[PDB]
Amino acid sequence: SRLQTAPVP
Amino acid sequence: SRLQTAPVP
Amino acid sequence: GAMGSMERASLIQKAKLAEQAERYEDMAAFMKGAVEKGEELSCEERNLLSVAYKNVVGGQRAAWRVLSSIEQKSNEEGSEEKGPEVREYREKVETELQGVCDTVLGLLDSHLIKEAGDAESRVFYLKMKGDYYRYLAEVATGDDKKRIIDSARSAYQEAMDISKKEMPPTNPIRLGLALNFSVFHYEIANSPEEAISLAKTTFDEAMADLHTLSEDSYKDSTLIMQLLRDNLTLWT
Amino acid sequence: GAMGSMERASLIQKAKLAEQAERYEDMAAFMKGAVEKGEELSCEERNLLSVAYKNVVGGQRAAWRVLSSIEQKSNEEGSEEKGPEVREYREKVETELQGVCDTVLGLLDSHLIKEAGDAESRVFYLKMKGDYYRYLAEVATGDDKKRIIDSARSAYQEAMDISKKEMPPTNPIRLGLALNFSVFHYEIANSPEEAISLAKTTFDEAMADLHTLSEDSYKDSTLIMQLLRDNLTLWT
Ligand SMILES: [Ca+2]
Ligand SMILES: [Ca+2]
Ligand SMILES: [Ca+2]
Ligand SMILES: [Ca+2]
Ligand SMILES: [Cl-]
Ligand SMILES: [Cl-]
Ligand SMILES: [Mg+2]
Ligand SMILES: [Mg+2]
What we know:
Chains A, B: This is Microtubule-associated protein tau. Chain A has 9 residues and is largely without helices or strands.
């Protein structure tokens, strides 16, 4: 992967 | 598939 | 318009950057600006114009289909009535799509087609005219629909007549034109037999000319031929 | 503004339609209009607002990264100088991104945050404030950059303090806040050890509270926990 941030529904 | 038309580069 | 102060070469450079960034609305505005400089377009530039508007109108078409489907479901018996909002928003998207189509058709009429003398350019532009009238047809209702369909058909026919006289059966532009006119016949003009006939004849005539091609040209032609085959498989 | 004449319920209905159609710029305009009606937002409505702007700014961020990379390549030694166009177009995209961020921050300041009394709403909005300052930080240069970073940090901290006092360690909003603040530390504030510490502690405290959850809540929490784990795997 790369870094991930919070998903949006 | 479904129907296809011409692609664009 | 707003691109009036930018150099033609800078507009083309930025169109290429916008393609890389997947910023297709920007790409279309840059290429509209380039067309409005009034010089004919090169083969590469014609492709940039086509890529830009196809991606913009493609987004609109997809959204319109989603909304039309929801709308049609709401107008079934036993559907709880939820007010005017679905129809309103579908009409908003529809109007924006019609506007993009009208912009492209405007560019072709003022003055890309009339200044196009070579077969490769004239066929490209006439195919595009057919395509954008066909996109208008997808959303049209009634008598407007009849005249729009005739306009698409007429543009496609003119392109076909030139392409048959002036281009080899393996030419990608000729193949893509035939592919799209065949879909026109099947989906818009309610002529599935004409669609199937056109796709088959186009495929078979290209097959018999492949022997003349270089490895790279062979790859370009066979890619579009496979699209004809895929449609024929669906239709028969 | 332009949504001033549309009912609040109609704006929310159309936001949902625009989500289905993947028309996120429209979705954002509808939700801005709903916020400007001046009533607090429900949990579902807050999610629609977040979805809309995250998709808009995400497109801009992706495009900006593409353009920044091309720009940086052009400013290497032995790079043929091609004029101002790359910098110009990167600045255009950058300005549009800054404008979206400023619109969101404006909505939070006028007056979503001050009217948010419950922890679930206040933490949501303060996280969003942190996020949109962080997006501004990604493109900022120099002294502006320092104040923008401090603004992001302050918003995230305030959110963390509330979430720790008022929400369980498995709460999805609390988990997503911690995920994003950890990325802030790693990517923006040049504090990789703080990033790793925050992600680890957050993960371990959620793990120990999973036993309290229903099957559905368990699924929601473990999804975000896996994101913390994925980052930790990259970083260590
Ligand atoms: Ca000039
Ligand atoms: Ca000419
Ligand atoms: Ca009202
Ligand atoms: Ca309140
Ligand atoms: Cl509307
Ligand atoms: Cl620009
Ligand atoms: Mg209409
Ligand atoms: Mg700037």
